[PDB]
Amino acid sequence: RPTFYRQELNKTIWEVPERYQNLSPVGSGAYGSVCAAFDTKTGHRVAVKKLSRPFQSIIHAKRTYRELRLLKHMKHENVIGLLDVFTPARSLEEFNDVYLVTHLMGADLNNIVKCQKLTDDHVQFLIYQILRGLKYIHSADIIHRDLKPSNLAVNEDCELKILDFGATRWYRAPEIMLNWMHYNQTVDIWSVGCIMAELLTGRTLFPGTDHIDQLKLILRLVGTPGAELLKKISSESARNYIQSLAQMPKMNFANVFIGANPLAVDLLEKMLVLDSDKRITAAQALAHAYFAQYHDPDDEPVADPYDQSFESRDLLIDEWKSLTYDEVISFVPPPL
């Protein structure tokens, strides 16, 4: 057990090990507050997140456990990883606060386009890394569900990490924006297509103002649902609404993205398919010719299987809290 020190910053008490120095508040909200800090053990800047009200209810206690289980499982170069998790508590009885430490990420994808025009090489590398992280995620039956440029961190070497597992609507697959059916892992592939289109053109692809406006913009590019997709939509009202729409053919993407790398446009056509069963998977997209400069099938690893059977458990607050405490205690830090 390290030595902790206690301080008040922005009327929040932070009690962290000595190794974390120069804490500066950089965010707050209902999920918790975040300080940037200097980790003297690794010599890196880190984000320290103090969870807010982690065990106030059953719902909160289970959400804390789910987040810690998820973050402890992710061990991949293009996915955010848990550098440390700690509590000042010496036992379960006084366990009330949970702190999570991750790499401090200097810029997101929105930030990097603000000060430079990305080359087609830059876009190949960025999208390749996103798909490489997603192949790992999806191989553990994890879905991100909220991929967007602000959840993608990029450094000065154009190296990328996927953050913050589940303007959000602009990157959402239509079957989950309107709750048409149970989510496929390829809802994340839809988001990658939206991000890639935006990086290639400098314009948001589907910037609708509400759900209906956005759905109409999507359907104008990809076509209205056919009978095979309509059969998969379980909500009867959703099916009746889609059938009320004037039919629209899919558009030729090459006529929408003139001047872009033709292999880029080809990959976009494979990601932005309306039927999620027909969208390209992350593993398949890594093999697409657009990424020929970067694809190495021996350097695109998969995850350990991830046991989500806890999700169907019905437990007391203090049982979720005890499970969380066990996961804090059993945490093994990554190698330096």
Binding site: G106, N111, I112, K114, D121, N155, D157, C158
Partner: peptide, 7 residues
Amino acid sequence: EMTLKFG
């Protein structure tokens, strides 16, 4: 790929 600028 090689380099990007900070915001």
